[PDB]
């Protein structure tokens, strides 16, 4: 039987609990103002991603799996995985018809166009744009729009082995959860789709390679295009602006 057992259902409930605030409203402030501007600048894009980044930190801090790590292990995982998780949120939030990202607390008139890439650093913008579109295209529409699938992919990439993590128990915990989240994702998809799920599982390593590549090559995208006085600091820890 492909039906989920109690432990699998409970793991999914816990994941949904940890992610439950990602879609909360924004408060008035720099980030909301940036999302609401029709004419967005590169700095506005940084201000927008700040919301998602802050919320990923909070999500992780709810997970028992994350809380079994040392503080240094937790820090290394977030630093190493932030942009990868952000890119997966980007796939969930991208509308192929409109060629834009939206957010679930604002209407369709509020968006970030794919063509915002055309304003970024010419050294890297073209291939980052193409990589994002190619990554988006490998997903089936009903899978990239499934919040539980997206959340699990985020956790699979968050719980990746990182060379800087040296505590042996941290490394063990990370490896075990990488495996567990991958297996749970496949079980979930089997419970919905039966044998047809297996093709999705077979594609996961291809997806992850594309995800790691795009995220690892993102760091200079804003260089020369942003004044630090206009952009949130957290994204500036991941993207070099000066």
């Amino acid at each position: 039987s492909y039906q989920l057992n109690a432990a699998e259902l409970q793991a999914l409930d816990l994941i949904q609990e940890a992610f439950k605030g990602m879609n909360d409203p924004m408060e008035q402030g720099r980030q909301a103002t940036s999302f609401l501007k029709n004419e967005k600048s590169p700095a506005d894009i940084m201000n927008i991603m700040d919301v998602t980044m802050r919320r990923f930190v909070k999500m992780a801090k709810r997970l028992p799996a994350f809380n079994d790590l040392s503080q240094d292990g937790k820090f290394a995982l977030l630093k190493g995985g932030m942009i990868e998780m952000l890119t997966v949120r980007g796939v969930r939030r991208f509308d192929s018809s409109s060629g834009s990202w939206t957010t679930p607390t604002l209407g369709e008139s509020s968006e970030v166009s794919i063509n915002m890439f055309d304003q970024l650093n010419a050294d890297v913008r073209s291939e980052q744009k193409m990589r994002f579109l190619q990554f988006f295209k490998i997903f089936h529409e009903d899978i990239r729009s499934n919040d539980l699938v997206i959340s699990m992919i985020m956790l699979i990439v968050l719980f990746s082995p990182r060379d800087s993590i040296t505590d042996p128990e941290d490394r063990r915990i990370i490896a075990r959860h990488h495996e567990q989240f991958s297996a749970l994702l496949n079980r979930y998809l089997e419970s919905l789709y039966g044998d047809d799920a297996h093709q999705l599982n077979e594609q996961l390593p291809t997806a992850l390679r594309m995800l790691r590549e795009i995220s690892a090559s993102s760091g200079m995208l804003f260089l020369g295009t942003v004044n630090t006085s206009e952009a949130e600091p957290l994204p500036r820890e991941f993207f070099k602006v000066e």
Partner: peptide
């Protein structure tokens, strides 16, 4: 990465 560390280490309650 001072701000990432701060956000990780803060009491969100």
């Amino acid at each position: 990465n001072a701000l990432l560390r701060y956000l990780l280490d803060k009491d969100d309650t």
